[model samples]
Target chain A: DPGDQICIGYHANNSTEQVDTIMEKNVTVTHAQDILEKTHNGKLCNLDGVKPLILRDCSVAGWLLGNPMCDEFLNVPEWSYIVEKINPANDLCYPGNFNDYEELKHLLSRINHFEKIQITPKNSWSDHEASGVSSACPYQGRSSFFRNVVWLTKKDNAYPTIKRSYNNTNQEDLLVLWGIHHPNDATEQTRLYQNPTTYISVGTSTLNQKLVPKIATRSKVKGLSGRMEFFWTILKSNDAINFESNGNFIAPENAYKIVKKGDSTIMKSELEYGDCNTKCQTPIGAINSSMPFHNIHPLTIGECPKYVKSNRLVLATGLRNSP
Target chain B: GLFGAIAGFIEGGWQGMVDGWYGYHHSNEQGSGYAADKESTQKAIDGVTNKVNSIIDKMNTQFEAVGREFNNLERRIENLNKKMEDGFLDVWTYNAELLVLMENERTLDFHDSNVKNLYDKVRLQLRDNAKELGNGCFEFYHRCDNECMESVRNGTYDYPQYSEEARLKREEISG
Candidate 1:
């Protein structure tokens, strides 16, 4: 408990826009239910019996204080990420500076950001033992459905704890993410337009050599799904934290020029069909401040989902559909 | 004298033909006709003179009626222009709606052998008139057209554009 109501969100990067972050006030059973309900097509206001279905906006404030789902589930990962870590005494953490819907959104994202940190499943990736097989996942009994991979950063630097570093646009991004046997594991059956087809780099017999990552060219029939774009990096010996080459897509033929054999799980993005921005070892600033992003194109595959949580269940949807 | 094949209308013209008998007579060009031919010729001569007056009156009445009809038509066209601007056509947005409309007008064209080119022409004419009412006229067409649907959308639901202003806007601005 906050012991007193507080703001459960991050603050504004600067105070120009309405999304100054330290937004929204309070949480209630109905509120939490509302948030979760919108997230999942099916509703969830009945829990702990605060109220069945309050057709109000989905408030994390409500989700935070109103229900036990916030505390009960381990990866309730959305809320606990913000609430569990922040020390209210020095910082403006949840239940403390509580209020503002935008802040609520920031917190939800902040919570989700911390939740994305994942690593592991280096080799024998398909084997349950290789992955952190979470059995109790909603997709129970299926190991591929929930990998629960760890993150690039130390757990101590999670969300509220590392707010300054993680949220800064100038600072590097984090993503220790990787992919294995299954790529399109998702919840919406096609959450990311989940292209199951991926280009993965594997080793030859000699430890001294590696094969070029395979590429799936665009088919005359299926365009985006058929095309294979690969990860490329070309850092120089000028390498004192100079990661300018990170996150670039390289042509398949030239990829061999950068392949430094013996590199393991770094071969492919963890979330195939999903964006790997979060997979960066450092938070890669999405925008190149040099140019303004005029407009964002829609996702080519299963159009970006409606329910954020349903969107989150990408892997589950893919997993269920696989068998 | 023979040098002027076509004499000046007066200089080489009839000499003593200025007054009555003199005005009507032409000594050098005198000619005669049969009695019956004269009377028939009289009717033929009067035909151009007397009959043409009534014909002139008839043409005036007919042409004026034509102009008046076209004028009333212009007013109708003006009213139709607004009505069409308001709501001209409707697209068959739903399958059922299309089916019902098809059923409603099923036998409309089945007018047997009695149907003339002239008969079908009028129906088509109404179509041309409706189309002129404005662009928003629904042509009963469309498909999976997921075009410019964004923060908002463009185009009408049932019809197309109504009042297409600026006729000059249509002619491609040339160099």
Candidate 2:
């Protein structure tokens, strides 16, 4: 198809002024040809790679010389691109190049200046989180659509585990859970765990101590028969966080927190629970300045109860142990 | 006897001060001293009077110099204005001539049609040039008002907008 093959061309040898003229003329010709081809019974021929010799203002002069080409093409012109010359002094004409470090420093300086001047408005965690996940399902339920995932962090080792349960096992379901470790802790071991009905966080108590931790959970559901459960817990000992639909607790949180704050060594063993076949460990790195938990989807459960029965539910956890 | 000489000296100083204040010329410029002779006092008075008159003459000379500069500026501006008006009239005349030529040569061959095309091209170019000249005229008007409005308002023949307009109309007719 010549019409399809007629790609727009950019002239390399032409000066900016010449390019503007050529483009304007070529565009006019193409438009006239296209209109004629569509309305008339003529077959569209390709003008691909076709270069026309540009004369010095001769193209405009040719129109008065009984040359039907220019008049036919430029009959009803709208804006004159010829009259609009590019100003050499315009900033768009010459953008200076800067080194990577210089660019980074410039951006960082701008951010710091904006922060110091209070140019950006202050927002609460819930408001920010809501804004971040603004496109999710309005209501919370097992069958609700999963818009996004969130990670929660806990600082204090004294936090207790939270639990949520799900019913209805007939239809296959999709569940998405979001959690993050609390960042405000100075000294404590905190971890997050998930199961069928509940999401749990386990942590050591630093009530009088420096670290006081908290956990946040946000979930979205796509398809489900009834309600889904969530559980959370904080473990003092080297216990794995578990998530099993039935009574068995498959600890999944221990795998997520790789490093203990007091000890710089990484954890080697996988945290396991009931029926090793059903239990599995998938470690999630801690949320910090370098590793932000934004836009991170930790765990996805498809065909909830069916998969939940054979394969143990995986728990996505964040470890924060400050000594 | 000493009191009488002191009184005479005081009277002389008082008289000198009055003469200086009234330009009697007996006293010096500072009005603190008097001439040694009456003849010298009269000469001093004549010299002072001539100096005052010369000051007035210098002021008239400066006024004439300013008037000449203003006249030069006015003539330059008028010339520019006349050129612009004539330029615009020429553009219209050329355009009309090209239109007539183009209409006459509508069915002619390429060789014969070239004449009309050439005329049309020149006509368009002239029209554009005329617009540029018109803009120049506007700038000149602004300059004249800014630089010599006060002189014009004071009934001085320093700015020549009126004369320029008449001259421009005459040039348009001849051109």
Candidate 3:
């Protein structure tokens, strides 16, 4: 009912490059629709026109802008977090700086520093939600054919975003998720409950007792529906995060040791027996800086030692720790 | 001393006569037979030599034709190499066009093997024609492919969301 045309999208961190933060641009609905139509065809996100699809792009050519509303319906917490709190001044719904090609070029130069940019468009959500749930029309009663789970991130200085550009060199990274839950919850209901997968912790002088947190490990099986249920205990001190037997494991002090092998950065782990001093470090897996997720090496009883064996872990990187 | 000299002379004379008789009889018989064999053998050899010379002339003519054929083949190969090298821009354009087509096909999930075959044949034919004409070969292929596929899909009513014109426009804008 108000005066002007609006373009809606969100901001994200570009995972693959050392480029500046992934900023959101407000384009004409005509322009946005043109880009969206290239990928989604006539089946645009929120085809019913109830909820507006958000749009944001990476340093490359990918833009993730669609329904943040439906993610909540699917029970993925912190959905549309960045967009929900976005500054209205930069919003494209009203007139803004990003309407023209020159503006986009300027922004790209500032952020990506690429002299020439080639863009390729891709899309998702609603038309492809897996859980068979939607608040919007058409897809509300329908089950998604291609189930996709997308992860977005918050800007963190300590653990900034990175793009995979090191074909010659190496990059180090770390991740730890503090939570325990039933894996069956997601499979049976297609919803992931409160789980904080990625956290940023800066080193401290003395011990911070209040900062001391519980660490966990889980048992897992093979298959698409497979997941590990976390079993954890509260840690006594942050000097070393450790776990005991009967399937108890810890996020060790040396857990954050980042090793770059070939293309990706591999994180490793260790198990503590009596004193938690004797070290037998093994690789967890590689972190894909291209997306908001990292892969844990598939653990089996035979290929690995008794201490390092565990299930396949698909860790999604998210917000940073509370200072 | 006079008797000894007469006896030695008579022995020498008898040895010379025996040697002359054996030499004349053997030379006369063998020389006449050898002469007769040489005359017949020379005739046969001369006739066969003429035949071989004629065969060599015929073979040389065929060999000349073969040399000309090889020259033509080398010319054709050199011409094709020139075209392939010169068609860089056209190839780039074709690649851009192909990317557009692939992106379109992927979006619509429209897999027509006939259309696929048509594009393939056109590409090869265009390269061949370009080899002959020495220009715009890849562009011609891409143009035909872009148009034909668009027309075919248009008939099926499964239009691509992204058009070549639109794509080029975006390219220009971005660059």
Candidate 2, A255: how far from true, in Å? 24
Task: Give lDDT per model, in order.
Answer: 0.19, 0.21, 0.21
lDDT for residue A276 in candidate 2, whole number 0-100: 17
DockQ of each: 0.00, 0.00, 0.00
Question: Tens digits of per-residue lDDT for model 1 on B63-151?
Answer: 00000011333687756654543231121112222332232222111111112222223224223112121211112111112221110
Residues A1-323 of candidate 2: C-alpha lDDT, one tens digit per residue: 00000000010111111101211221111000000000111111111211111112222122211122232322222210111111211111001111132222222222201100111122221211122111112223221221222222221322223242222121211111212223122221122222122323332231111211232332322221112222222222333222221111122211111111110111111221111111111111111111101111122111111001111111111000011
* Docking quality category of candidate 2 according to DockQ thresholds: incorrect
Tens-digit lDDT track for model 1 on A268-300?
A: 111111122211110111111111110111111
- Runs of candidate 1 with Cα error greater than 4 angstroms are A1-59, A62-69, A77-101, A106-113, A116-323, B1-118, B121-175
lDDT tens readout by residue for model 3, B71-167:
2336887566556543643443343333323333231111122222323333343232211222111221112223333333123312233245334
What TM-score would every model get versus the actual structure? 0.14, 0.12, 0.12
Q: Please report how far candidate 1 places residue A211 from its true position, in Å.
A: 57
- Residue B9, model 1: lDDT of 14
Which stretches of candidate 3 lie above 4 Å from their native place?
Answer: A1-106, A109-191, A194-323, B1-175
| Candidate 2 lDDT tens digits, B127-167 | 31111221111112112322232232123424244446435
Can you tell me the DockQ of model 1?
0.00
In candidate 3, position A4 carries an lDDT of 10
Q: Counting only residues 3 or more apart in sequence or on different chains, how many pairs clash (N, Cα, C under 3 Å) in candidate 2?
A: 55
